[PDB]
């Protein structure tokens, strides 16, 4: 077995209107982190880790994300093609991720030069899972964007255990 918290139907999240893509792109520290696999590990916590988008000619993203762990910068890339409408997105050559059916991404809000929130919904060896991560153009950002944030999530049947906040590492991610 494994038990996750049902993914929340797309008409309860938002949708950034009229989103710039150009506006959207650079680094972008992952301030908050929500799901229903994601969970907050009480004794080594969460190292914050960045998200970089560069728009290619095509206008897709090449999307790297890096994160310090094992002593390392261990870098993790993927395309995001432009989906349904402006702000979606879906993942470029799925097929060479073994397992993975879907993959969807929604950029409910933004203001492009200070955070963002972000939905995540991938089916991975047919199980549903989904995330939000809340992005800030600096390591931290206000307790009201952050409350919001976990207003938000809640939203969509979170728990504040599926709910946390990765601590501001320099390592890799300056
Ligand atoms: O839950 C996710 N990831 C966790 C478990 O596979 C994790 O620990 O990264 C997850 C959910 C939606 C979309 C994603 O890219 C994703 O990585
Ligand atoms: O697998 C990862 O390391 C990862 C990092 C940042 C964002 C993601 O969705 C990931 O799956
Ligand atoms: O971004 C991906 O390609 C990906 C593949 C498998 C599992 C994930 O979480 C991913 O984010
Ligand atoms: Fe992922």
């Known amino acids: ?31 908050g982190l929500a799901g229903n696999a994601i969970l907050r590990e009480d004794k080594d916590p969460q190292k914050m880790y960045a998200t970089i988008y560069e728009l290619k000619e095509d206008k897709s993203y090449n999307v790297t994300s890096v994160l310090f762990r094992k002593k ?27 397992g993975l059916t879907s993959y969807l991404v929604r950029v409910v809000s933004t203001n492009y030069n200070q955070h963002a929130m972000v939905f995540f919904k991938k089916v991975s060896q047919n199980r549903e899972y989904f995330k939000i991560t809340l992005y800030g153009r600096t390591k931290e950002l206000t307790s009201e964007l952050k409350e919001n944030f976990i207003r938000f999530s809640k939203s969509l049947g979170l728990p504040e255990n599926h709910i946390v906040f990765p601590v501001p590492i320099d390592q890799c991610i300056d």
């Not at 797309?10 to 972008?28: E, R, T």
């Not at 702000?87 to 060479?96: A, P, Q």
């Open 1 to 31: 077995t494994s038990d996750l918290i049902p993914a929340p139907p797309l008409s309860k999240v938002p949708l950034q209107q009229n989103f710039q893509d150009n506006q959207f792109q650079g680094k972008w520290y992952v301030v």
């Open 72 to 98: 390392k910068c261990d870098y993790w890339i993927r395309t995001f093609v432009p989906g349904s409408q402006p702000g979606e997105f879906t993942l470029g050559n799925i097929k060479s991720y073994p």
